[PDB]
Amino acid sequence: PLLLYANRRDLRLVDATVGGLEDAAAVDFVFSHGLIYWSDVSEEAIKRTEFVQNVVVSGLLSPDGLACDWLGEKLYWTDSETNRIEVSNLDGSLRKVLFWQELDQPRAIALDPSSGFMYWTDWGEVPKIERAGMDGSSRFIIINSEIYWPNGLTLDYEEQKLYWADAKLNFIHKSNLDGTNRQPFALTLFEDILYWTDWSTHSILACNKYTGEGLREIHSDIFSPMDIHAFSQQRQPNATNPCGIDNGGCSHLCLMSPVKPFYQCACPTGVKLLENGKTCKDGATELLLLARRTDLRRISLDTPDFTDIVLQLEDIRHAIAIDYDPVEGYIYWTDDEVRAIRRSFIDGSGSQFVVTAQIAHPDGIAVDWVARNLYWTDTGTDRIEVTRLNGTMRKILISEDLEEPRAIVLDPMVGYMYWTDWGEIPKIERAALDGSDRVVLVNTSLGWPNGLALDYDEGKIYWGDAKTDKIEVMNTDGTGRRVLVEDKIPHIFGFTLLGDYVYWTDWQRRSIERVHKRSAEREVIIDQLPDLMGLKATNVHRVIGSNPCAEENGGCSHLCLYRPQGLRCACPIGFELISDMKTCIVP
Ligand SMILES: *[C@@H]1O[C@H](CO)[C@@H](O[C@@H]2O[C@H](CO)[C@@H](O)[C@H](O)[C@H]2NC(C)=O)[C@H](O)[C@H]1NC(C)=O
Numbered sequence: 001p002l003l004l005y006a007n008r009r010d011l012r013l014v015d016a017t018v019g020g021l022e023d024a025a026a027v028d029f030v031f032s033h034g035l036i037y038w039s040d041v042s043e044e045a046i047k048r049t050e051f052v053q054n055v056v057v058s059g060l061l062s063p064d065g066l067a068c069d070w071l072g073e074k075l076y077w078t079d080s081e082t083n084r085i086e087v088s089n090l091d092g093s094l095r096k097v098l099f100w101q102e103l104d105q106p107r108a109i110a111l112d113p114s115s116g117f118m119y120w121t122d123w124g125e126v127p128k129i130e131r132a133g134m135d136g137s138s139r140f141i142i143i144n145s146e147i148y149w150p151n152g153l154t155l156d157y158e159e160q161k162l163y164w165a166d167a168k169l170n171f172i173h174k175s176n177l178d179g180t181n182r183q184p185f186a187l188t189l190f191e192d193i194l195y196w197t198d199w200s201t202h203s204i205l206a207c208n209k210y211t212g213e214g215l216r217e218i219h220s221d222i223f224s225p226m227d228i229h230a231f232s233q234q235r236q237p238n239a240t241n242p243c244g245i246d247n248g249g250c251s252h253l254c255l256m257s258p259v260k261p262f263y264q265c266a267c268p269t270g271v272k273l274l275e276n277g278k279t280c281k282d283g284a285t286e287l288l289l290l291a292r293r294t295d296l297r298r299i300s301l302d303t304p305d306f307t308d309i310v311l312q313l314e315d316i317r318h319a320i321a322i323d324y325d326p327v328e329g330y331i332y333w334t335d336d337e338v339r340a341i342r343r344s345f346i347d348g349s350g351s352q353f354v355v356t357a358q359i360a361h362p363d364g365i366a367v368d369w370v371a372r373n374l375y376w377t378d379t380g381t382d383r384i385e386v387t388r389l390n391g392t393m394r395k396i397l398i399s400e401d402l403e404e405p406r407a408i409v410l411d412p413m414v415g416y417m418y419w420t421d422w423g424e425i426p427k428i429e430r431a432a433l434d435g436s437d438r439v440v441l442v443n444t445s446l447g448w449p450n451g452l453a454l455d456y457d458e459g460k461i462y463w464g465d466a467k468t469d470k471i472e473v474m475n476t477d478g479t480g481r482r483v484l485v486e487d488k489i490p491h492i493f494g495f496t497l498l499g500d501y502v503y504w505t506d507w508q509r510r511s512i513e514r515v516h517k518r519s520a521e522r523e524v525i526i527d528q529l530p531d532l533m534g535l536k537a538t539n540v541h542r543v544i545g546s547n548p549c550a551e552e553n554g555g556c557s558h559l560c561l562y563r564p565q566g567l568r569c570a571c572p573i574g575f576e577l578i579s580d581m582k583t584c585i586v587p
């Protein structure tokens, strides 16, 4: 029997007589494919190697359990810090959060693919051992009576038994699901011999698995046993995959199950499973996009787990404002340090720069998904600019008589552009999409207007205010002013609307609350996630409306700027219209 144990900076084998890492807590293998997976609590990662590759980095905090399904070819792990258990394919793709609720400090995990069951421990105020289906079916609590700091769960498939230790009560028990025999950090099995690692001897102790007698010593001097396993093919019994030729018709994940056909079709986190029961939707249909200062994250509003997948993006340093075009599936954000605006997909792939030049404090960004333009406000230079989503055709759209412009939004199908203002006399303004008809919409009871949402469906606009700590609702002209909620407002404020709910950031920028725009009910969605800056709730599919600009750029040689009264073509900096008001020249 060879024994594989997570050291911490090292990974190594012991007998019967991978290095250069910082804090390993867990280890596993798929002997058939010759793979070895480990977890790093300091590096915040899970990697693999053959006899290195990144597998899960996209946001862990302390993952201590790690188990490989060799039959469904899936990787299961637990994060004691984030209070959730997750599954993924062997290389990390198609990642799914199996559990998240009623979880304290999930530690060790072990699998039984043929039966399709998982097992794990809780290290909270209420420590426990619980099992469920490999598909997250039927959560069942098994051990509650007398345990504190349980760890190193191991199963004997040859004799249908479950072993474990207790790093606080110094026993090694055995059971199965019920009936319990009493017979130490991590532990494993091989044939007749159960090997464990002792908190106070720093050696690998071994004993009989039926009686216990013969308390032999395997290897001394072993200081760090963060996890321990038996490295043998026979530790992973063979079975045919019940999924078969092709994922049992699953479009994505085919996970082992205890019941029915003994396989269950699953979808990655957030995304829903169709009437089919085998095919996923093409991603989540409803997204809450999130701009932290240094990361960028997404929350599906399709599922009640609200899990913020980190976007795989490089160099976010001081992000501020965010928005998204549904037509191309593009995310656009701004960065107060890099002094630029960036592009990318939900994935975080295809990352590109959109604008790099004369930007100071781009506190507001807005996509026009009809005319295919992009607007932003700049508190620094004190002007509202517009390009195309590309970043070309840059034109200064409002500059004179504008001080401290902040949040910006557009109503392309109507022809309206709304923004907030500070300075000498703060206000909410409206113009046509070419800066024309600049009119003041709200004049009084404003201090620091911070965020604007449009309720396109119901002719409403929403805003919030730093100084007055109020979030107000109003008609998009013909007023119906009303303060919907009363709460403190962050200087930089992530404000967004979609559906029947309204998303915003709390004072400390530590949490995102939503409010049912109609009623009043406030439920905190995400917690414990600092440095929130900006938000955009959006329907990735649904694209509402159109105007004449959507066809052949309204016959304009550069910018198509839509008024409710018609349409005017526009020109970049240095350009000028010719005799016909449709073509721009360099005079
Ligand atoms: C269980 O046993 C079968 C039959 O021996 C294994 O056969 C393997 O087939 C795959 C391709 O299907 C080859 O890559 C391997 O070389 C075969 N293994 C051997 C030992 O010859 C089958 O893979 C086994 N099941 C699992 C899940 O690995």
Ligand SMILES: *[C@@H]1O[C@H](CO)[C@@H](O[C@@H]2O[C@H](CO)[C@@H](O)[C@H](O)[C@H]2NC(C)=O)[C@H](O)[C@H]1NC(C)=O
Binding pocket: 372, 388, 390, 552, 553
């Ligand atoms: C970004 O750039 C492309 C390519 O420059 C633009 O494509 C224009 O598209 C129309 C088709 O209706 C052509 O007639 C123009 O000749 C193209 N313009 C140029 C300058 O080449 C387009 O503006 C942008 N892309 C998208 C998808 O909107």
Ligand SMILES: *[C@@H]1O[C@H](CO)[C@@H](O)[C@H](O)[C@H]1NC(C)=O
Binding pocket: 440, 443
């Ligand atoms: C805005 O406020 C100023 C100063 O009180 C006032 O003169 C003006 O009439 C107001 N505008 C509107 C549209 O009410």
